[PDB]
């Protein structure tokens, strides 16, 4: 994912409502041609108040649209199969094994895949070597009262890796199988 | 030892210390009402299920949708995703 | 593309299962063979009436030969 | 040497000797309780030829 | 009976004089041998009890419990090997001796012919248990838990001592055989009522009864794994055994005095299982499940119908095995994660598959999956209670539902879901742990084949 | 082998097969195949094992207990006589339970055998089981978990007193 | 008769061989699923032999091979009641399981634990066989709980998916609610008729009081997902499609109806129970079909159809027509499993797309599964001279021509139209129309396993109804003379449903977006039952458990009442006794007071 | 507040010193022997031999004897027309009812 | 129409009026909440991504939760009239209710037994 923000701007909130409204309308309009027709009509409604400048007026309109969205909410909206709430959501989660278990393999098991584990050792060394700089770099770029946002800085200088990278880089594949 | 739940905060100073202990803002922190039920100074977090929490946000504990160090609801076990859900309903 | 599949170490549980089966069968197989052999050849007993002026032993009131041996020797 | 073996594994006979001695002690108590050898009104029978006791 | 008692005593000098590298090995060997010897006692007669001597006897009630204790000792040693591996040789030998003393005391309790001898030994069991809990406990609540357990048991027992001496003075003998053959009905006088209370309350405390069960959670949670094993496998059954023995001379006053305890237990099973539903500690959940399962036995004993007693014996044996197994599994997880919070470790099924299978089978036995001896006992008790009153089925079925719910909840929370990311010390299951789980499960499933052995003397 | 008197099995009445269709009954061919490939080798193995048993022919006897004075003819504190009588009573209790079991087996076999006519063709079995049930219940019921010969004696005495009162009225 | 017993036992014993071999290398190898499938196929072929013997003569037997334990006057022995119901159902179940196993071999090919999956399928098959071939209530209960637990395991196949775990727990919960009634029935029969065997129970019970039959009804509703205990079946779609196709479409779900059918001689005696079953089944049919009308997940629609069918069987029980209900069980097992397999094929081809809204233009893309779905849906709607025609139509006829609660009959007939409606839904919105699935078309059903399994079920769905009906001996007196409109009512209602559903589907094409109606919200929210009845009770129970029991009583009052109070009293007394003053004057004055008091009191 | 050793690190995994551990102790040979002892005596002996011993345990519950005696009694009762089971567990002749 | 929230059906943020407040104090409060969250997240990540660390990362919040749920219950308990009333009515109330029900049923059955009305034709197992 991406680093979260403290709040959502009024523009961001309207965009979020726009995507939800279209998706619910698509759920209502099973046939594609039917959806495309009403999609533009709904888009026009957003365009009608695109010029709207008064924030109080715009906020008032936003409240009304969300109330309208709830009343017109599809009781059983379409959710992507691997999306949260989908039929296949978290289906392969059990097959995802953390990489640190490989270090617990018996020497016989590690002998079955010598080349892979040899390359794995290289990755282990890389993590340890860069770790000290990672923490040090974070301190340098950390504001006085600690971090106020969860966003992390990149590798400023060559030879360094982005701080706190091991888990993101070595995370389990979508389909371990 | 001081990082353990204590008695109901009486002075505002006690309330601030409790808020700091639970890693909550002093404004947000709210102890359970002093009804003698043994709740103590534990925060009265909103009674919303873990399912309501943003599924796209990266949680430290994904299955529980929780972060490390975040104050834990008193009835979390009841409000787990596998149990009672308080999410909004269309009707 | 053959990709390495991260798995928990399976050698230890498999070893436990192997050892358990080995130790169980170490005596089960002889015991099962003995049971089959005794039942096939020695067989059970017939409910004959007590002969006159005879006091059957405590093991002579049981039918299955293994049960008779157990009663006679351990009881 | 076998001596070294028994020197380190002598404690492995205590409990077996315990069982043997217990069998003896149990037998002793039974001998003390032989007061109704063939006096029960259910198992009263004449000793068979060349039988010292019924051991009951 | 000395064929079992004497080797158990001979275990102590062996353990004290065994080499530091051979303590556990010798103890386990000879404990298993002693269990094999104790297996002979299962050949109970149809009517008469096996009266070995004037002091020791056994029946179809005592023999299963004796076999259970003699079998439980080796598994306790195996479980104790792990945490007691950095202990000095003297203290390790001390722990082994405490376990051996507990086993010897329990054997003598289950075989004692004289009621006062049974009281002496059954209250002697407190000393080793207290020492084990207070000395080798891991938390700081161990001292308070030991105090609670000891004081609850003593407050129950002392009136029992007074009552037993009174019976000896009046009847003339406390031998179970004489007490049963010369039984005389009790009147409804207040003196008889208080005698009945004195004779029942101690065993009610021993097997956790709702209201007097507060000691059990503390004891089981704080005690070391072996101590919890005995506490939940034999020490609780001590109450049931004593109550079944003592009810012989407590009739017909039992009919009038059972209602309070009967209602307490019938509501307590539901209450404790509901408490299990909302527990945050694994060991506490196991303990409360034990409370409910023992309340079932309390009901069975109070009703005094033959089917109830058969089901009570079967349930006692089954629960002993299951609770010991559950505590062992929780101990393995705790040793790996160094915490007893249930929600701390999640998705262990992926990391440890075989231990997850053990968890599944143990939970299935806990919810009384047919035809496990657990279900046999539970169903017999349910039928007996239904004969007592048809309304009982409501509470009994609800309790069954809640038991299934919380057992599967435990399995799902621990052995299912997304694995905890930060926990990286979960190593592969040791052979010893798997062997412990197997030696807990296999005997039970085999016992299902021939339930007659563990169906009590009323079979 | 068993006593047909104890376990009455009405003489079998199998109807004669009278095929009216040219099509060959598959059941007949299947039964012939099953006999040849299964019954024959099974019978041969049985014969071999029976020969082995015939070689090692030994007998086991049935222990019989003499009658012992009942608890009625027993002194108040005579524990020896009381023990004898109680053991006799428990033996008789077991025998009565087994008698009930035998009659129940008869009833179940009748229910299955008579098929849809079970209601009309098992009246005798139902009556027998009812009689045995009544007798067993009157003799042994409500005694309690700690049942004893003295308890049956007390129940019988109470029953006899009630019978006397009823007859006097 | 001798081969009858031998073969009947051997089928079940052969079914156990794969489980035993799960300890060998075959389990580790990739041949284990094929070995399982071949074992099931051979067992089905063996099961055909007793079926042929029974068809020729009517041979029915009970085999009490092993004696478990004799509890005083109650003897428990493993007894297999091989009668019409069991001897006929075993082949049907085995054939369906064979087809399902082939489909699983295709569908679950990539699954890492496919061998475990097949072993679990065999385990459930064994439990269901024990349930079917049970002469003791204890043996039937073993099958009951074994089926429930195997369902628990298979539904929660994907442990990572929290929804799967919740669904499995919910299934166990509802099934246990039924098991309460099952245990009540067992206890009642033991206490009153001193027996757990069907024989003596039937013999002694000739009036069969309400209580045992009511408990049996509760258990049947639990296993057959009747109203009140219905939500578990729809939620059971979380498991893999083969699991839903085999257990929760054809074997597990029919267990309750089989329980009621097995006790038909007792059920006929009582009258209130018949009416209760009738009304309950009517409610289930109406509600489940109404919900199915507005379901966007294909598996959900099929599951609700299964629930409706089970309710129709329960209504048939209410008409005191057990054999007809069993025949319907068989036919439903034949066609509904095929429908589920076709749905699974659609899902696999469309890359886990279970929402019908994103499925379209599948009529020509998948001709074979299209034909199979068409035939199966037609049979489900009782197309004449199909498996549906030989059971459902007779059921409707019997309901109309009987002294029946009027509203129950009405609900059955309305439900019949809704049946055609949801069929039209799963045809129009999935196979017909223009494609709505994502691009990168990977549609491919050219798999021998899938084709062969669906082909076997197709041949069954087309001819098995005729074969079975024309072979089984007559057991129900027919309603020969009947008003013509009543005779054709089933077909008329089906045609009405088809026409109205197709009309509404055509209006869906019209470019007219309209806001949801309250009735549509009610139907689509499953009548709101899984919302309020899954939040309020659970919340109250858990909150009460944590507060009133755990804290308020256990950790607060119970401790305050005995230990805390006693200890506090002891502490205060200790403080009083150990005044820590230590002055000779005071305790010597106390000595003087003691002397005076003793001299006065004891004189 | 006190000069005490720092908390002992997480218990050393016995696999670290020897990959083949079986648990039990640390010395590999004694681990092997402990596992052999537990498995041999625990599984091969008690679990197998004792199970066989209790399986063929001689019937002293008098079950078969009870059934055989019941068969004899039923034969006699039916042959003589006597009721299969009487209505009194003891003879009324010897009961001196008050 | 409008949506009425309940305890088991909370009000969504989209319909929540508070979500639309753009006042400066609310923005500062949101910033402070994010700051606390970021600090805790940073600490957890630092421990979590440390190669040397081999063990469970202790979570103080979890310890506090477990302690408060069990350990701190009694210490904060006060014998208020509400607590006493509720404790009595849920401790002895159900016991007395079940006692009454069971006693009445048992007495009814015993009465039927005494008059012989109760049917026990085959009730030979109890």
Short mmCIF file of C-alpha atoms in Angstrom, two decimals, chain A residues 97-98 102 105-106 109 113 116 173 177, chain C residues 3-12:
data_model
loop_
_atom_site.label_atom_id
_atom_site.label_comp_id
_atom_site.label_asym_id
_atom_site.label_seq_id
_atom_site.Cartn_x
_atom_site.Cartn_y
_atom_site.Cartn_z
CA UNK A 97 4.91 -19.19 5.10
CA UNK A 98 7.35 -16.64 6.59
CA UNK A 102 13.61 -21.80 6.15
CA UNK A 105 15.08 -26.54 8.04
CA UNK A 106 17.12 -29.65 8.76
CA UNK A 109 16.15 -30.26 3.76
CA UNK A 113 17.90 -26.74 -2.40
CA UNK A 116 18.63 -21.25 -3.25
CA UNK A 173 4.37 -14.23 -2.96
CA UNK A 177 1.12 -22.92 -3.64
CA UNK C 3 9.99 -21.36 -7.79
CA UNK C 4 11.20 -22.30 -4.27
CA UNK C 5 8.15 -22.77 -1.96
CA UNK C 6 8.79 -21.52 1.60
CA UNK C 7 7.50 -24.24 3.92
CA UNK C 8 7.93 -25.20 7.57
CA UNK C 9 10.55 -27.85 8.22
CA UNK C 10 8.88 -31.20 7.61
CA UNK C 11 11.72 -33.54 8.51
CA UNK C 12 11.02 -33.54 12.26
#
